[PDB]
Amino acid sequence: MTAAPASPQQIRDRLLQAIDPQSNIRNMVAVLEVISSLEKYPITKEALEETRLGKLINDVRKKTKNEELAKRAKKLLRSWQKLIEPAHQHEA
Numbered sequence: 001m002t003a004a005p006a007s008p009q010q011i012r013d014r015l016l017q018a019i020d021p022q023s024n025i026r027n028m029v030a031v032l033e034v035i036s037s038l039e040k041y042p043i044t045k046e047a048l049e050e051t052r053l054g055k056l057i058n059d060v061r062k063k064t065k066n067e068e069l070a071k072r073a074k075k076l077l078r079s080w081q082k083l084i085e086p087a088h089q090h091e092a
Helices: 008-018 028-040 045-050 054-063 067-081
Strands: none
Touching: 008 028, 008 045, 008 054, 028 054, 045 067, 054 067
16 A cells, blocks of 8 residues: 655554564565665655664665665665765765
């Protein structure tokens, strides 16, 4: 459900209904909606800390759709990581 979540807080709610708070998967199919959404909507930096999506980075790293993709994802994640390390080359 929901083709466009837009705001990061709503993504968190969708994550927790797919997995246990202890970061283990109950429904991979439900997880796929979260990652597929994140592929269309990258989490903003102030929202990343606000909604605490950094834990999602930990879980998606191991439970991502494609293990090879997790290596590629770093390019996208760097747009978020700019809050700890200067990364704002062209997405300004």
